[PDB]
Symmetry: C5
Subunit: 394 residues, 5 copies
C-alpha cells in the first residue's frame, strides 16, 4: 500500500539528468571509498593488477525525501541503473578492454534522502610493477577514481578510509596497506579542476615459492658445477659435466625472461644472480680446457716454463699441501734397455705436467668456491627486503 | 481468451520496484537453493572454481494472484527480466570478469502468487585451493550467495538443501558433498545485518592421472639413478648417466611449478617428494666423483691412509662379502727385469685403490637404495588421504 | 500498402507474454530439430564440443493469421526478438560462459499462422570424452534441448530428424550420425514433467595425424633403443645411446599428458603403449649395465660361476651359433718370460668374460625385440576400432 | 529548420518491420559487395580466417523520398539501427562466438530514396585450409553472405565486384584475388530458394619466413648428420654426434605438429620432408653401429667372410681409391719372440677389420649424401608453387 | 529549480538524428584530438598496438543554448549516449573484435552551445610492425579517425595537436612523438570526400632487456664454441662440446621465431646475427672432424702429401711460433730389437700427423675468432639506431 504510493510519488517529475542539489550554484558532496575483498592477480609481464573491490559512494538526493509517518513501515527505497541520478565515477587507469568494469547494482535511499551505492566489480588497473628487487619486491599499485564529466565546481568528491575488514589474504602477496589521497588536478581539456581519489595498494611478495623454484635450484646446480674441479682428468668426462650444467642453467634463464616484463628500467635482482652464476660456470669450463691442456701436454713439445714450475709446482703446491756374437747380442740388448730408459724420462715429464693440471684444478676449486659464495650472498643481501623475507617466509 | 485477459489485468499498476509484501513492515521470505549439475574446472593456479549450477529462488508475490475459476485453464503465468519484481541475489566471491554470470530466465507464478525462478549459469568463484597434500588433496570451495541491496529487515533469506540428483561426475574430482549454512553478518557499510547462504563443495581429487604422470615416472627415474653405482668405473660413462638423469628430473620440477599456485602458505607434498628425489640424485653424483677419485688415484701420489684401508678394505668389504761382455749383458738384462718388477708393484697399488672405489660404490648403492625407499614411502604416506587414494583410484 | 496495413493490424492487442493457443487448457505443439553445419572443435582436455548449428523451431500462432485475398501479395511477415511470442528452448549442457549462444533472428509467419524460427549459433556443449581407446576412439556427445520454463502441460515438444545435408566434413572427425530422442523427465523443482530432445553426435576420430605424430615416431625410437645390444662394449657409448633414447621418449609422454584430460576413469590406450615402450627401454639400460659388468670384469676378482659358464658360454652360445754370470742371466730372462705367461693367462680369463657379455648382449637383443613386437601389436590391436582405422586412414 | 522538418515527416507511420517496396508482390533488389581492407590472421590449426571488411549494401526505400526544393540544403538523411528497415544479411560460415560480428553504423538515404549501408567488422569465417603443399600453399577461403529470413521471392540479392583499392598487404599472404559468385540454393527448411553471394579470397603464402625457420635449418642439420661418416672410429664420439643430431630434429617435428591442423586428409609436404630427413639420419645411426662392429671386431672371433673381403677390401676399395744354461736361455728368449710374432699377426687381422670399417664408412658417406640430395630436391620440387615461391620470396 | 527547468526546456522538440547546424547547407565543424595516456602493448606477432587514449571531440550545437541570467547558477548541462546528437567518429584501422572500443561518456554543453565530448577507451589498432632492425627498431603506428557516415559536405573535421601531458612512460618503448595530419580522401563507395585525422605514434624500442636475453647470451655461447679449438684431441670430448653448443643455440633460434611476425618482407637483424653465429659454430664442428682425421690418422695408410707438410708443418707452424746356440739367441734378440725400431718409426709418423692436427687447430682458432668478431660487430652496427641504443640503454 504505502510502498506502492511512495514509489509513484517519488518519480513525479524526477529527471535523472539533474544533479540533485537544492541550490544549483553549490557543488554536490560525494563521499567515495572502497572495500578491498581480494587481490586476484598481479600480472608482472603485462603490468596489470586485478582486484575484487566494492566501491562505496554516498551522497544526498534533495528530491528523494519523504515523511515516514505518512508511509508507515517504509524506511528505504531502491532504484536501479538509469532511474535515479548517479555519480559517474570511473577508474582512470583501467586496463579492462571494456574500460568500465563496475557491475551496476541498486541505489539505496532513506527517508532523509541519503543515497548509498555500493557496486562491486573485478577491476583491472594499469600498474607500474618494479622488478628491480624481484622476488624480494614491494609493489605500490594506484587505483585512481574520479568523476569523468563533473568538475570540482559541480561535484565535491571527498575521501573516506578504505575498508579491509573483509579482505581475504592472497597466498603470494602480503597486504601492507591501502592509504588514500584526495587531489585536485587541472587538465588541458578544461579550465575547471577535477578532483580524484587515489588508493595505493602497498603489497609485499611472499618469497617461499620463488625461493623453491628459482633461488634454491640455482644454488645447488651451481654447486654441482664446482664438482668438475674434483673429477680426475683421466675420467674423460670433465667437459660433459661442465657444459651440461651450463646448458641446464639456461632453463632458469628462459624461465625468468618469461615472467619478467620486457622493460629497460633496471636489471632485475634475479637476473643479476642468474647471470653471475652462469658466468662463473662458463669460466669454469674455460679453466677446465686449460687443465686438460696441461694433463694432455705432449712430452716432446715445449718445456714447462720457469714461472710455471715455481708458481704451481712449488708455491701453490706447498700452500695446498699437495706434494763376436756376444758383442752383437750386447748391442741389441743395450738398445732395448736404453729405449726403456728414454720412455721412463718421457713419462716422468708427463707426470710433472699432470701434477700441474691437478694443482691448477685444486687452486681453481677453492677460488671458484669463494666466487660463488661471495656473488650469491652479496647479490641476495643487497635487497632491502631480503632479511624480512627470510624471517617471514622461511 | 483468458490467458490474454489475465496478463492485462495483472500488470495494471504493477511496479517492479516494489518489494511484493502485503505489509510493508514485514520482511519478505525468500527460499534459496541450487542444483549442482557439473564441476567444469578447478584452476589451482588461478584459484578459481567453475561450476554449472541452477539457482533456485522461490517467494510469494502478493499482487500476482488470481481466481482460477474466473480464468479457466490458466494455472500459471510467466514473466521475463524487468517486468516482475525479483530478488537481487548475487555470488559474493565471483571471479567472473562480468561479476554476475546468471542467464536471466522467466519467473513462473501460480494462482496463489507463489513465484519460482530457476536461472542457470556457468559460475566462476574465488576459492582457496590448498595444495599442501597435492595430488592427494581434498578441496572445500565456498559459494556465498546473498541479496546485494536488501538487508534482513526487508528480505528474510532462508536456505534449502542443495540438489545433486542431476549431477554429472567429473573424471578428476569425486564429489563428497555440498552442505549449506545460513548466516547473518554485519558490514561496516550498513547498520542492518545481511543474511547469506554459503554452499561448501567438498571435492576429492582422483589420483590415477597424477600417479601416472607425476609419481610413477619420478620413482622409476630415481631408480635408474641408482644404476650408476653398478656401472664399472672403466666404462667412462658414470658421470654421463648421473648428470643426465638429474637434468631430466627438472622436467618434472618445472611441470609442478606450472600447475601449482605461486603461494607461500606451504610446501606442497609433491614438491617435497620431487625435491628429495633430486637431492638424492645430486648426492649420488657427488659420491660418483669420489668413487672416480679412488679409481683414478695416482699410484705415486699419497698412500692409502690407515683408516681407509681398515674401514673399507677390511670391515665394509667383509660385510659386503666382496674379498766382460757377459757382465754388461747381465747389467742390461737386470735393468729390464727390475723395471718390470717396479711396474708390478705400482699396478698392485693401483689395484688396491680400484678395489676401494668398488667397495665405496657397493656401500653407496645399498645406502642410497635405502634413502630412496624411506624418503619415498615416508613422504607419500604422510598424506591423510593416501590410503584412500590408492584404494579407490589404483 | 497492404504490407503496411497487415503489420498494423496484427499487433493490435498482441501480447508477447501469451502462449499463442486458442484453448488455454491445451498444450502448444512445438517441433524441434537442428541442422549440423560443422564440427568446429573437440576439446578433449576441457571436455567441450563446439559446433555450428541451425536450430529449427516451428509452431502455430493462433493470432498471427490473415486472409491473403484481403492483403494481395502478402504471404509472409517477419518479427524480431521480443515482438512475437517465442519458445524459450535452451541447450541444457551448455559450456558457454554466456550459457545461451543463440544468435536471435527473425520469426517467419505465413497466412495460416505457422511460425518458423531458425536461429543459428556456435554452440559449446559439455561432453564426456572417453579417451580409453585414444587415438582410435569414437565419441558420443549429447546436445540436450528443452523449454526452460514451459513444462509438458503447456508446451508439447516434438522431435524431427536432424538435417545433415549441408554438413561440411571435419578433417579430424568422421561423422557417423546424429540420432535424436524425445524424453519426458521429472525434476525435484517441479511436479510437472519437462520434455527434452537429445541429439547424440556419434563421431569417429581419423587417425592419420596421430599415427604420424604419436604412434610411428614411438615405434622407430623404440627400434633405435634395440641398437644398444649391437654396439660393441669397447666403443664406450652404450650408456649414452640408451639413456639418451629414454630421455627423448619423455617428450612424447609429456605431449600425451598435455592433450588428454586429467581423468582417472581409465588409462588411455596411448598411455599404455608409451608406458610399455619406455619400460622396455628402461630395462634395456639395466641390462646394459649388467653387460658392462661382465665386459669390464676384473680378472683377479671372482671366478665365473659354474652356472654362468654353462648357461651362457655353452647352451646359449651354441643356440645363437656364436662359438755364474750365465745363471744370473737365466734367472732374469726366466722372470721376464714367466711374467708374460701370467699376463697371457689373465687376458684369456678376461676374454672369457668379454665373450659372456657378448652372448648376454646377443640373447637380450632377441628377447627385447620380441617384447617390443608383442607389446606393440598386442596393445594396438586391443582397440575395437583399430582395424577400421588402418583400413580408412592409412 | 528544414532538416528538423524532414526527419519529423519521414517517420510518420514508418514501420521498420515492412520491406520497403511499393508493390508487395515484387521482390526488393539489394546490391551486395564488400571492401577487403586487411587479412588479419590465418589460423591453420583452427581453420579460421580473420579479415577486416566493409560490407556494402544498397537498396531503395520507397518511403524515404522527398522533394529537395521543399527542403533546401537537405540532400541526405541518416538513420541508426532499428529505426529504418534493413536487410538481414549475415555471414553463413561465421566462426565468431557471437556469430554476427558486424558493427552497426548509420544508413545513408538520399532524396530519391536510395539507401547506402556500409557496416564494418572484423569477420571470423570457417575456412578449409589445405596444408598438402605447406609452406608452398595457396588457400581459397569462402565468405558466404545471404539474407537469413528473406528468400528470393522477397529479396533479390545481386552481386557487385569486391573492392580491393584500400587493401593493405599482409607480410605473410599475397592476395591473388577475391572473385564473387551469386547462387540460388534450396534448403530443406523451406520451399523458397535463398540466394547467396560467395566471395572466395585466393591468397598465396609468402615462404621466406618458413624457409628460414623450417626448411633451411633442416637442410643444414641433416648435412651435419653426414659428418658421422667422416669421424674416425677411434674418436669414440660417432654415436654421440648421430643420436644428438637425431634428437634435435624432433624439435622441428614437434614444431610442425603445433602449427598444422590435426587432419587426416593428406600428409603435408613439410611432414614428408622432415620425416624423410629423420629416417635418413636414423639409418645413418644404424650404419654407424655396423661400422663400429667391424672396427671393434675381436681378432680371435670369426674370420672375415670371403664375400666381405672381395666386395669391400677389393672392389669398393679400388673404386673409392682407398688402398745347458745357454739352451734354457734360448728356450725363454724364443718364447718371448714368438709371443711378439703372434701379437703381430693378430694386430694385422685387426687392421684388416678396421680398413673394412673405413671403406663401409666411405661408401656410406657417398650413398647417404646422394639420398639426402635426391629426397630433399624431389620432395620440395613436387610442389606446384615451389618455382614461383623461390622466384618471388628468395 | 533552474537545473530542472533548463533540462525540460532543452529537450522540447530536440531530435538526436539532426546534425545541429542553424543552416542546413553549411557543414558542421568538429575539432578532433586525443590524449595519449599509455602505450599498453605492442604485439609484434599479431601486428597490433594497444593504447589507452582519451578522444577529444568539440563542436557547437545550435539548439543547446540558453541565457544564464534566466537560469542562475546553471552554466553547464550533461547528456548521455543517444539523447544528444554526436559525431560518429571511429578508428578505421581498429583490430578489436567489437571494432568500436570507445566507452561512451557524457557530453558537456555550456550556455553558448559549445559541446565537449571526451570518451576514453582501450584501443587496439592494426599497425605494420617493421622488424628489419629488431631489436633496434623504431615503429610508426597510425591511428586513423574519421566520421563514418558524414562526408566533408556535412562534417568539417579539423585537427588539434595531440596531448601527451598525462602520458605514463612504458618501460619498453620510448615515445618520440605523436604528430597528426588531416587529409581528405575519395572512396569508390561515394562521390563525396571523407576527411580523416591520422595520428602517427613514433616509438623507439628500449634495448636493455633484449641485449640481456638475446644478444649477450648469444655472444658468450658463441665464445664457448671457440673453446673446441683449444681442447686437446686426446680428451675425446671435442665433438661433445661443439655439437652441444650448437644444439643449445637453437633455443634462441626458436625463441626469435616465437616473437617475430611470420612475414617475408625482410630478414630481421636478429635473425641475421643468430643465423651467422650458428653457421660459424656449425663450420667449427666440420673443422673439428678434419682435425680428428689428422690426429687419428692411421700411420700405415697414406703419406702426408707434400703440400700438407709445407703449408702446415713449415709455414703455418713458423708463423704461429709452434715448432750354434749363441747364434740362435742372436737371431731372436735381433728380431725383438728390430720390432721396437719399427714401432718407433711408426709412432714418429703418428706424432707428425698429431702435430698437423694441432697446427690446423691453432690456425682455425684464430680464423674463427676473427670471423666471430667481424660478423658480430658488422651485423650489429649496420642498424641505424645501434649507436643511440647503446648510449641510452646501456
Ligand atoms: C675470460 C674468458 C676466457 C678468455 C680468454 C681465453 C682463455 C683460455 C685460452 C688461453 C689459455 C692459456 C693457454 O694455454 O693457451 C694456449 C694458447 O692460447 C692462445 O694462443 C689463444 C687463447 C685465446 C682463445 C680465444 C677463445 C677464448 C674463448 C672465450 C670463452 C668465453 C667464456 C665466457 C664465460 C662466461 C697455450 O698455447 P701455448 O702454450 O702458447 O703453446 C706452446 C707452444 N710451444 C710448443 C712452442 C711451446
Ligand atoms: N629464427 S631466426 O632468427 O630467423 C634464425 C636463427 C638462426 C638460424 C636460422 C634462423 C636458420 C636460417 C638460416 C640458418 C638456420 C639456423 C641454423 C641451423 C643449423 C645450423 Br648447423 C646452422 C644454422 N640458424
Ligand atoms: Ca583440477
Ligand atoms: Ca598463416
Amino acid at each position: 500500500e504505502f510502498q506502492r504510493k511512495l514509489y509513484k510519488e517519488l518519480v513525479k517529475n524526477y529527471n535523472p539528468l539533474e544533479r540533485p542539489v537544492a541550490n544549483d550554484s553549490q557543488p554536490l558532496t560525494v563521499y567515495f571509498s572502497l572495500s578491498l575483498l581480494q587481490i586476484m592477480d598481479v600480472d608482472e609481464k603485462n603490468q596489470v593488477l586485478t582486484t575484487n573491490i566494492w566501491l562505496q559512494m554516498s551522497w544526498t538526493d534533495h528530491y528523494l525525501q519523504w515523511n515516514v509517518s505518512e508511509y508507515p513501515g517504509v524506511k528505504t527505497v531502491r532504484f536501479p541503473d538509469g532511474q535515479i541520478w548517479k555519480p559517474d565515477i570511473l577508474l582512470y587507469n583501467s586496463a579492462d578492454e571494456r574500460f568500465d568494469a563496475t557491475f551496476h547494482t541498486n541505489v539505496l535511499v532513506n527517508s532523509s534522502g541519503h543515497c548509498q551505492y555500493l557496486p562491486p566489480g573485478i577491476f583491472k588497473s594499469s600498474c607500474y610493477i618494479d622488478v628491480r628487487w624481484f622476488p624480494f619486491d614491494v609493489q605500490h599499485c594506484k587505483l585512481k577514481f574520479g568523476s569523468w564529466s563533473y568538475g570540482g565546481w559541480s561535484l565535491d568528491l571527498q575521501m573516506q578510509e578504505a575498508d579491509i575488514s573483509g579482505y581475504i589474504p592472497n597466498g603470494e602477496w602480503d597486504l601492507v596497506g591501502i592509504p588514500g589521497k584526495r587531489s585536485e588536478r587541472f587538465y588541458e581539456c578544461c579550465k575547471e579542476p577535477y578532483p580524484d581519489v587515489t588508493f595505493t595498494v602497498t603489497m609485499r611478495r611472499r618469497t617461499l615459492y620463488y625461493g623453491l623454484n628459482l633461488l634454491i635450484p640455482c644454488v645447488l646446480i651451481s654447486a654441482l658445477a664446482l664438482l668438475v674441479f674434483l673429477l680426475p682428468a683421466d675420467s674423460g668426462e670433465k667437459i660433459s659435466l661442465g657444459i651440461t650444467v651450463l646448458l641446464s642453467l639456461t632453463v632458469f634463464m628462459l624461465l625468468v625472461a618469461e615472467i619478467m616484463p620486457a622493460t629497460s628500467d633496471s636489471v632485475p635482482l634475479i637476473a643479476q644472480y642468474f647471470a653471475s652464476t652462469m658466468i662463473i660456470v662458463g669460466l669454469s669450463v674455460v679453466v677446465t680446457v686449460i687443465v686438460l691442456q696441461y694433463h694432455h701436454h705432449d712430452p716432446d713439445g715445449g718445456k714447462m716454463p720457469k714461472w710455471t714450475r715455481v708458481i704451481l709446482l712449488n708455491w701453490c703446491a706447498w700452500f695446498l699441501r699437495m706434494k763376436p756374437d756376444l758383442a752383437k747380442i750386447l748391442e741389441e740388448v743395450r738398445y732395448i734397455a736404453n729405449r726403456f730408459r728414454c720412455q721412463d724420462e718421457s713419462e716422468a715429464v708427463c707426470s710433472e705436467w699432470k701434477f700441474a693440471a691437478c694443482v691448477v684444478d685444486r687452486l681453481c676449486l677453492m677460488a671458484f668456491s669463494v666466487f660463488t659464495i661471495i656473488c650469491t650472498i652479496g647479490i641476495l643481501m643487497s635487497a632491502p627486503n631480503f632479511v624480512e623475507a627470510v624471517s617471514k617466509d622461511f
